[PDB]
């Protein structure tokens, strides 16, 4: 009984990158052993969130009554090598027939724009619904390009606007924009530029960054160009690269603005010397409580490729305290698809009476239901009409203290709360 598999009357896919590995040349046409790679505690947590959402719905006589939900889940540390599990979800009796009812009715994920751009075209072809809990690339709002694509996090445009709100709420107008050397980081660069062109904000420096960036010289330029505001648009790995290198190089008295991919990071706030590099601000997904997840995790800590975690002797409380961002996006993803299937079978809420994944797609678009008192819907592009951003400040207790908030159709900041280094 694997964590990655679970039988059911209808299968939903699950795309996660639980492990990390930098890209590397390969001479053979075969999957990667991700299990022997670098574990990611926050991703495995989102991983578990999917498993919890399916179990919770399976526990319900209200949503999909007497219709079990199953799943095939994957750990795709490399987007290049994800296709075998992709082929799994889209196959009919493990055959792919390119010219023509598949194993799965839809898929939750992937996390990464890069994972998404690599595989989404194959999904779109038959209007096979993908619901991403993470991909923020603004190219995904173009619905002709990605017709069966939807998501539960906002576009980069929105987050970039919030970041710019933060910048404008203060007095600094030269900025460094450090961004990850992938499609996510790049899109962020594009959107940031697009947003500040007609503005007192002057982009004074930028650079694609990776784990092997000469951070020593990136920071001399930034200093000699006297920049105090350093926006870092990057996910966990790249974020820790920047910030950790910032402490090792007496980078000091800067204002760092985080995006929601590292503003609730847990390694960096508790790190020795972090307070010496200035002050950390960011937009964050506001922590949403998911009743019952805690008990679930305690219960869980207790083959085909990329379906092995290799993660025993894992601390239950490490897991629970890991960066909780993207929780509700995963939560609302699974529930979104479940509701869409519930309505395509035309279930009541007592019982349910052939499901093509595109039939799931039309109900997915029409999504309208409550979840933890949030309304879950999408616009005609597939972008979510729910979620907000809080403005946090990293304080002396290692906490991302909430000091303001942003709402996508309406920023406010209580500046006294920020204690500047």
């Amino acid at each position: 009984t694997s964590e990655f598999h679970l039988r059911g009357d209808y299968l939903i896919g699950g795309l996660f990158n639980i492990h990390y590995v930098a890209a590397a040349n390969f001479q053979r046409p075969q999957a990667i052993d991700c299990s022997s790679k670098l574990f990611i505690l926050p991703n495995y947590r989102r991983f578990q969130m999917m498993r919890f959402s399916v179990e919770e719905i399976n526990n319900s006589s209200s949503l999909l009554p007497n219709v079990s939900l199953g799943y095939q889940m994957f750990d795709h540390c490399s987007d290049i090598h994800s296709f075998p599990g992709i082929f799994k979800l889209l196959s009919v009796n493990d055959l792919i027939r390119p010219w023509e009812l598949p194993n799965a009715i839809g898929v939750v994920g992937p996390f990464t724009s890069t994972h998404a751009l690599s595989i989404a075209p194959i999904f779109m072809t038959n209007l096979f619904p993908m619901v991403s809990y993470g991909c923020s690339g603004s190219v995904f709002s173009k619905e002709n390009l990605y017709p069966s694509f939807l998501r539960t996090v906002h576009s980069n445009k929105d987050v970039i606007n919030a970041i710019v709100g933060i910048i404008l709420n203060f007095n600094w107008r030269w900025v460094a924009f450090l961004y990850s050397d992938d499609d996510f980081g790049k899109d962020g660069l594009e959107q940031f530029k697009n947003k500040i062109e007609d503005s007192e904000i002057c982009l004074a420096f930028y650079k694609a960054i990776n784990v092997n960036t000469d951070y020593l010289q990136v920071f001399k330029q930034i200093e000699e160009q006297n920049i105090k505001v350093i926006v870092v648009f990057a996910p966990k790995v790249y974020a820790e690269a920047v910030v950790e290198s910032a402490v090792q190089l007496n980078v000091t008295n800067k204002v760092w603005i985080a995006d929601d991919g590292w503003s609730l990071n847990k390694k960096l706030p508790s790190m020795n010397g972090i307070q010496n590099i200035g002050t950390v601000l960011g937009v964050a997904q506001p922590v949403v409580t998911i009743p019952g997840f805690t008990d679930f995790i305690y219960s869980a800590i207790s083959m085909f490729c990329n379906q092995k975690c290799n993660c025993s002797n894992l601390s239950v409380k490490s897991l629970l305290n890991a960066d909780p961002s993207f929780s509700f996006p995963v939560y609302a993803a699974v529930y979104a698809i479940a509701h869409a299937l519930h309505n395509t079978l035309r279930c009541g809420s007592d019982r349910c009476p052939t499901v093509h994944p595109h039939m799931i797609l039309e109900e997915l678009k029409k999504s309208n239901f409550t979840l933890l008192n949030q309304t879950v819907q999408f616009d005609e592009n597939g972008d979510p009409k729910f979620g907000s951003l809080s403005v946090v400040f990293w304080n002396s207790s290692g906490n991302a203290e909430e000091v303001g908030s942003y709402h996508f159709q309406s920023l406010s900041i209580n500046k006294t709360k920020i204690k500047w280094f």
Partner: antibody
Amino acid sequence: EVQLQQSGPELVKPGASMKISCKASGYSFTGYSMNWVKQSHGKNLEWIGLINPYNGDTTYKQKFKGKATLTVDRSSSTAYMELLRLTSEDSAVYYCARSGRGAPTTTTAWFTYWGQGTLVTVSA
Amino acid sequence: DIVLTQSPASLAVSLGQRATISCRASESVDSYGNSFMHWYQQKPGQPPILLISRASNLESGIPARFSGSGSRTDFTLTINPVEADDFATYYCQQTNEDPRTFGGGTKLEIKR
């Protein structure tokens, strides 16, 4: 074209109040500080203050605190400056001026676009 | 508050010759690797036009016969050659620190 259009000249009584407007067009209103400048006859430029049209934060030169109030209306892209308890010393020309792009702080910003100006005449 | 003292207060320059206007600040107006001293031209009845920003950066649309230099507390505007419509008051302006302050102005007359 960026334009800053101000109110016509005003004749206003001593000890009364008046509000000068600066309709902005041709750029994104909230992206730049709007500044105000007094010039007496006896030509000297004097900075009254600025406002951030994004959040309404204001900054003033000391001698104009309690004498000037800068506001904005984002639905009309207008900056306002209300003058209070007017004496003949407030008889001057007032300019609204937008900050430029290129400065490192909102404070260091210089003035690239100017209103045509508003003559204020304080008299009974 | 930084005092800017311009000299001379008044100046008449024949056509095609050189005008050198100076501005002295009470404190340095250097910061961020720059000098926040700017030059404005105000013609009679008009708003000031920004000629030069940050001590020496010529602004769009302003002829290269206008130029400036200086740093810290000593700055100069030069007009070379002078032309017939350059009579105006020329103001320097610091924006290094709050509040912004202006020099008392130099009035350039065309000498003929």
